[model samples]
Target chain A: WVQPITAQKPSLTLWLDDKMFTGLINTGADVTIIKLEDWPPNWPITDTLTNLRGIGQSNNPKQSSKYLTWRDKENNSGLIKPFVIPNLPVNLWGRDLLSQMKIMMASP
Target chain B: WVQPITAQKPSLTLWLDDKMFTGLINTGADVTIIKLEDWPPNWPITDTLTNLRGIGQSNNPKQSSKYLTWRDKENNSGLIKPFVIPNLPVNLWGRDLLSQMKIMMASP
Candidate 1:
């Protein structure tokens, strides 16, 4: 039974594969990552994701707001995305975030 | 005059050379100037000088309380000394004093 399921009266809509999002659910994410390279056109960019600017500034010509979805490229379809914090300014998943989360910075 | 002139019951008495002291009065003298070698017996060690420890401690065994007069050795026979300050703890003419006088120290 192949059915298109769009729940009625949903405030925010996220379509992601369940398998991929499960693996990333417990992981934290950030928005300040700098995307230095562009993937192939068919590389499946998710509308649910965003682009990071270096230190919170994106490299895109438009400097558009971008985010990374928890869904992987293969199972992006039929994925159940989690609620994302609104208006995130920095990359919350990169070394800056993880380092702060799990690592101690050297003091002067 | 060739007369021995100890002032008429003056409160403070100093016997310093007239000519040498005239020069040194403008300059400065400190007692911590360690005398390593004894000149001739009559080389004229003034009863007025003291030793200095590395910092304020004197290396001399006696750690004598001596003061340097404005008088020099050769003209030590009869000279008019200046008023000495009482109870000084540190050598008043070392690098601590002169450096404070002449040069600026490097800031840390």
Candidate 2:
């Protein structure tokens, strides 16, 4: 679910229940990731399903997760488990969530 | 740049010294990658600029590279050094090259 023909990465406005969160679209990311601070305080955390591989590095820490119900501007709705880590630089919209959307891009 | 908001990943038609290649756009990928088999037979190979990493695994093997002169359907042209590996499942158009194009996406 990416839009815009610009050199910069596309940031998306998504819904997590009633909360609004801005996330960047990342094609190389296999799974979704959210920073611990960005999560809703009352939401519960569970076991993470996958490990994140950085460029030229392998650091699989014990991160937390929760099955978040989400919706996009396209009205595409789904359940995705996002890994939460401390001090993450950005909220990444990885392939897991991106694969669920009906995406289209072309010259304008 | 990604176009078409669909459940599938976007495949781009690109050119390498007049040779046509279809590559997938990957945001999680730090650098562009090409399989040795897909590269132009006449193109010269040099030392690779980076390593390839698999999901949940750290396997950086010796790969080759070439400062490929390229052009997209949009006529966006540039020189990119792509890591050439054997048996790579797909030609990844990563952030390095994607960062140079003017990409735009929106609802139809």
Candidate 3:
């Protein structure tokens, strides 16, 4: 997903033949495999933090700021949390990212 | 000011002459003097964030993992933030930098 592409790059093709075969063993029919590369050609490019289009959005500035603050808090909380409860890290990726995704989807 | 100029760069001249006759009269001598090359001819193109503009209008991926997150938690306190703020010691332009600025500005 972090791969960089130059301009006028050719249409991409992900021959997920291997992944599909492996995934089929776990799921029955009608399984919808979601692949990052499978996104539509028109899929918008967004910041990983706020899921907002990295460019062309008024809310981008605000989104960037809050995401940074939260990330800081999350890291601090992690270092402070004792190993007695490892789930603290698990819960880190909760609603913040989700809400951001929702907001981006709703934005023009 | 923070002089960095190159281009047609025409039309910039100032003459202080005497600070006010003695040194310009110490003030209160029909003074309307204000100068910085006296400013005009398009005032943008100056940037203090020098390191930032090393490039043009291009997508800036998160130089760090906390890309694109900000101004969250305003409407909802429960929303997750996007980035992890490293400990204060690691914050860029953190207390250490602030301390440096304080010293520099205060220097006689």
Candidate 4:
């Protein structure tokens, strides 16, 4: 919080099941991308969505959507289907869920 | 307002004197970039800042800073010294100014 402008990238504390994680709030992202490797091996996917509407299995990196339970610091709970992928440097908060949730950054 | 996610990209209305303009709030931007041509025929630069500081005669699309007046739709006014340029297709609200003001996007 020392510098005014560049230091303004804010983060959020989220809970996935019993694990707590931190992710940045990015408005520049068009899609919400979550790192698949960061997820616990025993984590549950409420619903899995892929390009193959019916069936298919490929090891290649493909952006997929899955319903996951998320809780805020205030203990608020909700389910959101975010794009899951591997090899992402970090998780991003994009316009997809951001606008739906009415989240925005503004100056006072 | 129609679709939740994809349609969540919000825009802002700003005034540079008597004319009004719209710009998107993008957290991905590292530096604030403003279009020079979009400015009015007659405008004043409160302060001119550049890399050369004391002297320069280059037009190589250098990134420079300058102080300018900005006002919101609510009539709130302030001065922001954004990087001015001519080739940029659009304006960017970067982290430097965004963070300095402690601005961020989040879900309610």
| Candidate numbers sorted by DockQ from highest down | 2, 4, 3, 1
Candidate 4 residue lDDT tens string, B1-108:
111224545555676445676655556555555667775545543334443110112222334334555666556666565656565445656565455445534345
What is the per-residue lDDT of model 1 for residues B1-108, given as tens digits with 9 covering 90 to 100? 011112111011223222221111011122213221321223234343433322112332222233334332233332121222323322122221122222121101
Candidates' TM-scores?
0.16, 0.63, 0.13, 0.56
Residue-by-residue lDDT tens digits, candidate 4, A1-108: 111235545566677556776766666555665678776666544434433110122232335334666676667776655665655556766666555455545455
| Pick by lDDT: 1 or 4, better one | 4
For candidate 4, what is the TM-score? 0.56
Q: Number of clashing residue pairs in every model?
A: 27, 20, 26, 10
Error of 4 at B55 (Å): 36
Tens-place lDDT per residue, model 2, A28-87, is 565777777887767777654455645344445433345677898767788877777656
Return the top candidate by DockQ.
Answer: 2
Output the better candidate (3/4) by DockQ: 4
* Candidate 3 ranges beyond 4 A from true positions: A1-44, A47-70, A73-108, B1-53, B57-108
Runs in model 2 deviating more than 4 A are A61-65, A73-76, B1-9, B18-22, B28-67, B72-78, B81-91, B99-103
Runs with alpha carbons beyond 4 Å of true place in candidate 4:
A1-6, A17-19, A36-61, A84-89, A99-108, B1-6, B16-19, B28-30, B35-65, B83-90, B95-108
The regions of model 1 sitting more than 4 angstroms off are A1-108, B1-35, B38-43, B48-51, B54-58, B61-93, B96-101
Q: Residue-wise lDDT of candidate 3 within B52-75, one digit each (tens)?
A: 110021132222221211121122
lDDT of 1 by residue, A1-108 (tens): 011111111011222222111111101122222221322223333333343321122222222233333322333322111223323322222222222222221101
